[PDB]
Amino acid sequence: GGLGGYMLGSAMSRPMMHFGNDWEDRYYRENMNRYPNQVYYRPVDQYNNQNNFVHDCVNITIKQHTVTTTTKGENFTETDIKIMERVVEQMCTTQYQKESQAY
Numbered sequence: 773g774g775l776g777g778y779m780l781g782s783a784m785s786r787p788m789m790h791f792g793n794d795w796e797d798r799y800y801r802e803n804m805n806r807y808p809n810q811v812y813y814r815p816v817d818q819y820n821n822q823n824n825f826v827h828d829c830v831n832i833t834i835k836q837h838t839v840t841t842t843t844k845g846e847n848f849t850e851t852d853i854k855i856m857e858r859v860v861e862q863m864c865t866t867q868y869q870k871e872s873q874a875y
Contacts, residue, residue, distance in 0.1 A: 773832045774839075778812040781867050785809075789859060800855060806848075807856050808837050811864050816871045829864035830857065 786804060791797050811833045819825040834856055838848060848856070 773812055773836050777814050778832060779815065781811050781813070781870075783809045784863055784866060787859065787862060789855075789862075791855070796851070796855070799851065803852065803855075804859075806841070806846075806852070807859060808833055808863070811860065811867050812836055813864065813867065816868065816874075822865070822868045822872070825868050826861060826864045829867065830860050833860055833864070 786809060789800060789804075791800055811829050813825070813829040813832070816825060819828070834853070837856075841848065
């Protein structure tokens with residue numbers, strides 16, 4: 773992620789997400805193309821519970837996406853970070869589910 777050990781998953785379909793209010797739903801519809809469609813992570817063998825994996829997958833993926841987006845001149849607000857937190861969490865979850873069923 774700038775220092776080693778993370779791997780990049782295949783791209784996943786962006787989910788329909790409902791955020792519980794009109795303004796965030798509209799915001800989401802308009803801004804969702806700006807958020808990742810793939811996750812960075814560390815091998816599944818290296819975590820105790822899916823909970824950690826997910827937590828880690830999320831901060832690292834988002835932080836790296838933030839460096840590549842920022843270099844390009846545009847910035848994420850706190851709302852961006854919040855939403856990104858949720859959707860990257862679901863995607864990391866699908867990723868854990870997928871990598872662990874390696875049997």
